[PDB]
Amino acid sequence: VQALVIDNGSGMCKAGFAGDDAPRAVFPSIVGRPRHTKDSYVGDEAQSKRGILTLKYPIEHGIVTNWDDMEKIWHHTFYNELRVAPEEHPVLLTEAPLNPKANREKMTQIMFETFNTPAMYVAIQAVLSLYASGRTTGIVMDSGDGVSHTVPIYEGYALPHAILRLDLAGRDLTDYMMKILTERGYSFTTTAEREIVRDIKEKLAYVALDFEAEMQTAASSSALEKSYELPDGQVITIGNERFRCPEALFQPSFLGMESAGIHETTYNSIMKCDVDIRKDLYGNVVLSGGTTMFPGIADRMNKELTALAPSTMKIKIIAPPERKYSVWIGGSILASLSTFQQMWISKEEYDESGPSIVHRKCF
Amino acid sequence: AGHMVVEHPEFLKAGKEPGLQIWRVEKFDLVPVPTNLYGDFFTGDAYVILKTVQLRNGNLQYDLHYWLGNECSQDESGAAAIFTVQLDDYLNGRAVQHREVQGFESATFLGYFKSGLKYKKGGVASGF
Ligand SMILES: Nc1ncnc2c1ncn2[C@@H]1O[C@H](COP(=O)(O)OP(=O)(O)OP(=O)(O)O)[C@@H](O)[C@H]1O
Numbered sequence: 392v393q394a395l396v397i398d399n400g401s402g403m404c405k406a407g408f409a410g411d412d413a414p415r416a417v418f419p420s421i422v423g424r425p426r427h428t429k430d431s432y433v434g435d436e437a438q439s440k441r442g443i444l445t446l447k448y449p450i451e452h453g454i455v456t457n458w459d460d461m462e463k464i465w466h467h468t469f470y471n472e473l474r475v476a477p478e479e480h481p482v483l484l485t486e487a488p489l490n491p492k493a494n495r496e497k498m499t500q501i502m503f504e505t506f507n508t509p510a511m512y513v514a515i516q517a518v519l520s521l522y523a524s525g526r527t528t529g530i531v532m533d534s535g536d537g538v539s540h541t542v543p544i545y546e547g548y549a550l551p552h553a554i555l556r557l558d559l560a561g562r563d564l565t566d567y568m569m570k571i572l573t574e575r576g577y578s579f580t581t582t583a584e585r586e587i588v589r590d591i592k593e594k595l596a597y598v599a600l601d602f603e604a605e606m607q608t609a610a611s612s613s614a615l616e617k618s619y620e621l622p623d624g625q626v627i628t629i630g631n632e633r634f635r636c637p638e639a640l641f642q643p644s645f646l647g648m649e650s651a652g653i654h655e656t657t658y659n660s661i662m663k664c665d666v667d668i669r670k671d672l673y674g675n676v677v678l679s680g681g682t683t684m685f686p687g688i689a690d691r692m693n694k695e696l697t698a699l700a701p702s703t704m705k706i707k708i709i710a711p712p713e714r715k716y717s718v719w720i721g722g723s724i725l726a727s728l729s730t731f732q733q734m735w736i737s738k739e740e741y742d743e744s745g746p747s748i749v750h751r752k753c754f
Numbered sequence: 755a756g757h758m759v760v761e762h763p764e765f766l767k768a769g770k771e772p773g774l775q776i777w778r779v780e781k782f783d784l785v786p787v788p789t790n791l792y793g794d795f796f797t798g799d800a801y802v803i804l805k806t807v808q809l810r811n812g813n814l815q816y817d818l819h820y821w822l823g824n825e826c827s828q829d830e831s832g833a834a835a836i837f838t839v840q841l842d843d844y845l846n847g848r849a850v851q852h853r854e855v856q857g858f859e860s861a862t863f864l865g866y867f868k869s870g871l872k873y874k875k876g877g878v879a880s881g882f
């Protein structure tokens with residue numbers, strides 16, 4: 392029996408088959424409906440047809456906010472992306488840390504009642520990333536579309552009282568790159584233009600080890616400047632914007648936020664945990680998610696955490712090349728284990744107990 | 755839980771008496787290592803080691819070590835970590851978990867192998 396794994400991101404859904412090393416389908420978590428006056432489109436097709444559709448993003452900060460739209464995404468995922476009949480497959484779904492109780496139940500109700508899944512399971516994204524790195528203890532800094540989570544985990548279980556979040560992630564960095572590129576005189580405002588800004592962010596941005604020193608270097612020469620060719624053929628020049636953009640992760644004040652940067656958030660989560668486990672958290676800081684993909688980010692996290700921690704504390708940042716997909720891969724391994732069959736919620740169990748069984752089977 | 759109980763045959767065997775038990779991750783399963791091969795680790799593989807010690811009142815002390823070869827694949831190291839959590843849960847959370855990386859193993863782990871553990875190249879193919 393072949394299990395499916397679906398990682399429900401706020402910006403991008405990752406879906407595929409347990410036992411594969413990568414998701415088969417990666418597509419925007421978007422539902423489009425006729426703009427004025429097929430009833431709906433999902434994913435790439437919705438995005439491409441945006442000229443005639445109004446687009447909705449049913450997941451915000453990793454939390455589902457519109458269940459009708461989420462159900463459309465899942466229907467599309469099964470029937471169009473994976474080309475499966477969901478009544479034939481156990482399904483592992485992921486959830487944000489601290490996903491509300493009612494939401495976990497609703498996910499469960501939809502899978503069994505709408506899709507007739509024979510079995511399902513819900514796993515916390517950060518925990519799957521930790522497992523994917525081959526660890527049972529560590530702190531995961533999971534940064535994707537709209538939120539960055541810091542999730543301490545001990546001997547396989549998240550410590551809910553110590554989970555924190557910074558309300559800044561990739562979409563905010565894209566918006567910020569858009570804003571700072573206006574200083575140079577480049578106006579990017581449309582959807583296709585925002586996609587160009589996202590590409591500039593993904594291809595040319597980096598995290599400065601020493602931000603002040605980098606700004607000095609940028610101001611004193613053209614050493615750090617880079618050329619970028621627009622789709623029309625025009626060539627633009629990017630300078631300190633390359634590292635100012637992801638600097639916002641460490642200095643949220645760049646976005647007018649009062650919140651502590653990601654390094655401090657990580658430290659604060661560690662300090663909320665039992666003193667006896669903190670060594671193991673500092674020694675196992677795992678970066679996960681698309682927004683952790685900036686070159687230089689692991690070196691910078693190491694520098695910043697080293698400054699916050701006692702000098703004799705060993706800091707280790709683990710930043711796997713595959714970390715955009717760590718959550719999905721962790722799910723693929725978990726759902727493949729010979730012991731998995733004993734862990735899922737079965738249809739029979741759901742029929743007897745209802746949605747609340749999720750709190751007893753998945754934690 | 756609910757309608758299911760732990761049924762994996764190797765879990766049923768785990769930690770019943772004082773001693774050392776070693777399993778190798780093989781294509782998403784936990785497979786016992788022949789006892790005459792204990793201490794000979796494939797650097798391309800991941801393993802789960804349970805050391806059971808008898809305490810004074812007769813209860814059992816557990817240390818679970820998951821050993822990760824320099825060349826083991828992501829499915830193997832991930833599975834070794836998850837099986838470790840699962841075995842600890844099965845053992846009522848009584849086990850201390852230890853991540854053991856080839857060449858950086860704890861003194862405790864190394865001490866399990868009276869004549870010294872050995873490394874050998876190769877191993878079972880990835881389940882990916
Ligand atoms: N190489 C890269 N460098 C910087 N940012 C990147 C890179 N690749 C992807 N990103 C950013 O990662 C973000 C998407 O990350 P991810 O897919 O982990 O989020 P998600 O799963 O959609 O959302 P969430 O987990 O927050 O619900 C986007 O903002 C994207 O631009």
Ligand SMILES: [Ca+2]
Nearest residue numbers: 798799877878
């Ligand atoms: Ca192997």
Ligand SMILES: [Mg+2]
Nearest residue numbers: 400401516535
């Ligand atoms: Mg995500």
